[PDB]
């Protein structure tokens, strides 16, 4: 049996998001890609360096916004600009988000030497695609 990235069935009480519900074979069919860069296109270089930055950028955002992430973040690279689009729960006060945005942007712009912007869409609570 295949165990890869499959949220298995319980007794109908496990909420799962759209991203979690779909197994790997639905990638490019029902669900898209969380990161969009040009490094895996044919005749393009620096796939390894873009992929390592993604791993870190995801671990950074989880720790910097602990318990405030409704879904996995979406990374969008255009030219040298990096754009982070994160669904965040409305747990923290509003002013705290302004602090963490200023901090996380400046810190990641001086770490990778690129302009990095954070885009936050706040949800009242996690969106449930289906109960499995």
């Amino acid at each position: 049996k295949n165990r890869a990235a499959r949220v298995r069935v319980a007794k109908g009480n496990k909420p799962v998001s759209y991203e979690e519900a779909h197994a790997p074979h639905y990638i490019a069919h029902r669900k898209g890609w969380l990161s969009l860069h040009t490094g895996n296109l044919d005749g393009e270089d620096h796939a390894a360096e873009r992929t390592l930055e993604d791993v870190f950028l995801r671990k950074f955002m989880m720790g910097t916004f602990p318990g405030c992430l409704a879904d996995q973040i979406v990374l969008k690279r255009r030219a040298n600009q990096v754009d982070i689009c994160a669904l965040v729960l409305r747990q923290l006060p509003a002013h705290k988000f302004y602090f963490l945005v200023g901090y996380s942007e400046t810190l990641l712009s001086h770490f990778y030497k690129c302009p990095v912007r954070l885009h936050l869409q706040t949800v009242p609570s996690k969106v449930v695609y289906k109960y499995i």
Binding site: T38, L41, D42, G43
Partner: protein, 140 residues
């Protein structure tokens, strides 16, 4: 804005030099992406932009490339059981013609600055110039 509108918006300064301008006979723009729909939207934006600036454009779709590789599915043994992965590359070629160097810089900036994420460009400018003055006359 309903009642409050800018009066005399400031526009950049464009100064005509005395150097002659480059003459591009052709300018091929090969965009690449994993998504066909993004290329269709970019093709519409780029063709509309060219037609609005007076540039002559043609578009075709070079054949797509699919790169596949195989990996071992299990962490240990079970050799016969594999998992395969592929990366798909799609192309849209925008062939422009008879462009001066000023028209090709403004156009390329405008379309490159609006290049979607996951899209790679490969501009192939083809300049036309006279013969070298030494070559023009045979000298022994």
């Amino acid at each position: 804005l309903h009642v409050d509108v800018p009066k005399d918006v400031t526009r950049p300064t464009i100064t005509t030099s005395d150097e002659p301008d480059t003459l591009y006979k052709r300018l091929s723009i090969l965009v690449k992406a994993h998504d066909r729909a993004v290329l269709d939207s970019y093709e519409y934006f780029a063709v509309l932009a060219a037609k609005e600036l007076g540039i002559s454009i043609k578009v075709h779709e070079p054949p797509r490339k699919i790169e596949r590789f195989t990996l071992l599915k299990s962490v240990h043994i079970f050799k016969k059981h594999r998992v395969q992965y592929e990366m798909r590359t799609l192309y849209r070629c925008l062939e422009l013609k008879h462009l001066t160097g000023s028209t090709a810089s403004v156009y390329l900036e405008y379309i490159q600055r609006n290049l979607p994420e996951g899209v790679a460009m490969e501009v192939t400018k083809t300049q036309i110039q006279q013969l070298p003055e030494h070559i023009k006359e045979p000298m022994w």
